[PDB]
Design a protein around this ligand. Structure first.
Ligand SMILES: NCC(=O)NS(=O)(=O)OC[C@H]1O[C@@H](n2cnc3c(N)ncnc32)[C@H](O)[C@@H]1O
Ligand SMILES: NCC(=O)NS(=O)(=O)OC[C@H]1O[C@@H](n2cnc3c(N)ncnc32)[C@H](O)[C@@H]1O
Ligand SMILES: [Zn+2]
Ligand SMILES: [Zn+2]
Lengths: 275, 295
């Protein structure tokens, strides 16, 4: 695979495909890309940072389990009595399986950064005119094992979320599809925005025929507004959309494009990232 | 609880105890504390950043089940056939339980940031003289639901790890116990460093804890968040002896099983300690504290 040699300077193996330790070089770039996304944050956007886990009931209610049940990472634990837990560990010692004593927790590993934001916005009552804007981030999980550096199991997602009327969401989606292209241009990245309701900014990483989706522009209709009872300023079920940045894909795209030597990156690129 | 008043400015509920959305105010402080820890990084320390998950086999091999089986968060999924997965989803649609079809993955949610570093160091062969030093971080998970702001299920851990001879590790810990106290002092925090023990599970766990405490293998920097009677451990200074060196076959420069130690900073506990101590208005924080954090 073309991306393969990148691993030497960017990652260390953790004994699981798509789960890697990140070097100081790789992390410095993710942080600079994060800071660059932040610099493009619109006024009146509330920044929230989510942990890698979220409510299982919220995710179930959000319709994920129907669309990608195979990708969901659920949190399980040993929730039994001290005797049951000790017996599970003793089975492990005697060459058996301790995992039979696991039971699901009330938590899942988040498959997308924005999911927890919709119940949060709903708890505040009706939306003001113009709606709400959020800046969210989380370490996401998708059970898709691969040896390719642009397909991970654990990866960072950063998003700008619009909650309001279809007009609010439409104007937001239009502004962001323009802005995200200007960002990738500033980064010296080669791309095309194509259809995937869903648009993706695709960057050739292995092939020009099979490019990698490094950003997404999603429209959810009134799906989340209806699910959570989010009322817009006119008392109607709210519409939602989100602009998502694949932090790890963007970082891998940067290294594939410009190489692992930061001193040799273009001056404009180095300038916009504050290098 | 005495910390509850802070929740409004720092967190948003996520529908689960000890799992919170962080506000821009709270996050700006965690980042400044992270940058401050980084400024104290010793020369020749390799910085690695770990994701929130790690190999279940590596954790099993590390002996985590012998110590805290009750705290472990395991990744599960629907690993069955297309028919079994479709049936699971259909049960969920019909008000039933889809979770019966879950089976464990080859991954766990990391309970401590340093765990993945030991197999990484072992893969490099024998240690050089003076050993190896690592700077590690991860979002950790411990199955300990609580409504207290200093007891989370998902929390950030930052550590400096020493791998080498018992001398290398011992010098490193003493050096860091001095430095960590100077850091908390600079932060305007009230503290004490005391002998400690890990909360080992069950009946044997009580014996393992008393034995760990007497051996002085663990110290904690405790900050009163409720009282001096019950302070909060915001940092730990752990000496692992040869546990990880033996497990992973880490050989020191003398061909002996390597000794290991780690200095761990509870990012979320330190941030909560800062807000409890100095309040939620950053402009009113002491000048010396604002200066050291670059505010
Ligand atoms: N809420 C909006 C959303 O979720 N949208 S969407 O596309 O699923 O994912 C958002 C972005 O996350 C990145 N991404 C997705 N899957 C992976 C993966 N397996 N490895 C690395 N990066 C990935 C990718 O860059 C994708 O465009
Ligand atoms: N490797 C070394 C180590 O793991 N060491 S240690 O077990 O002691 O955890 C390290 C630090 O993580 C923080 N910490 C631990 N548990 C929690 C929790 N439930 N909520 C918030 N912060 C916590 C706390 O500040 C503790 O001192
Ligand atoms: Zn989204
Ligand atoms: Zn450690």
């Amino acid at each position: 695979d073309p991306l393969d040699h990148l691993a030497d300077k960017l990652f260390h193996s953790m004994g699981s495909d798509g789960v890697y330790a990140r070097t100081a070089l790789y992390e410095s770039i993710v942080e600079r890309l994060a800071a660059l996304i932040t610099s493009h944050r619109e006024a009146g956007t509330e920044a929230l940072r989510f942990p890698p886990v979220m409510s299982r009931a919220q995710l179930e209610k959000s319709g994920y389990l129907k669309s990608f049940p195979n990708l969901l990472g659920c949190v399980c634990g040993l929730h039994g009595t001290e005797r049951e837990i000790n017996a599970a560990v003793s089975r492990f010692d005697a060459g058996g399986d301790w995992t039979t004593s696991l039971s699901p927790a009330d938590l899942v590993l988040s498959p997308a950064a924005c999911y927890p934001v919709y119940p949060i916005a709903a708890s505040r009552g009706p939306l003001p005119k113009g709606g709400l804007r959020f800046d969210v981030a989380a370490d996401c999980f998708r059970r898709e094992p691969s040896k390719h550096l642009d397909r991970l199991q654990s990866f960072r997602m950063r998003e700008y979320v619009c909650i309001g009327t279809p007009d609010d969401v439409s104007d937001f989606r239009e502004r962001w599809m323009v802005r995200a292209q200007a960002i990738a241009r500033d980064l010296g990245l080669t791309f095309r925005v194509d259809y995937a309701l869903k648009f993706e900014l695709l960057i050739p990483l292995r092939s020009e025929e099979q490019p990698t989706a490094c950003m997404s522009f999603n429209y959810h209709r009134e799906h989340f507004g209806t699910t959570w009872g989010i009322q817009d300023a006119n008392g109607e079920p709210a519409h939602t959309g989100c602009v998502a940045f694949g932090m790890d894909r963007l970082a891998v795209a940067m290294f594939h494009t410009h190489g692992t030597d930061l001193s040799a990156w273009p001056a404009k690129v180095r300038d916009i990232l504050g290098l």
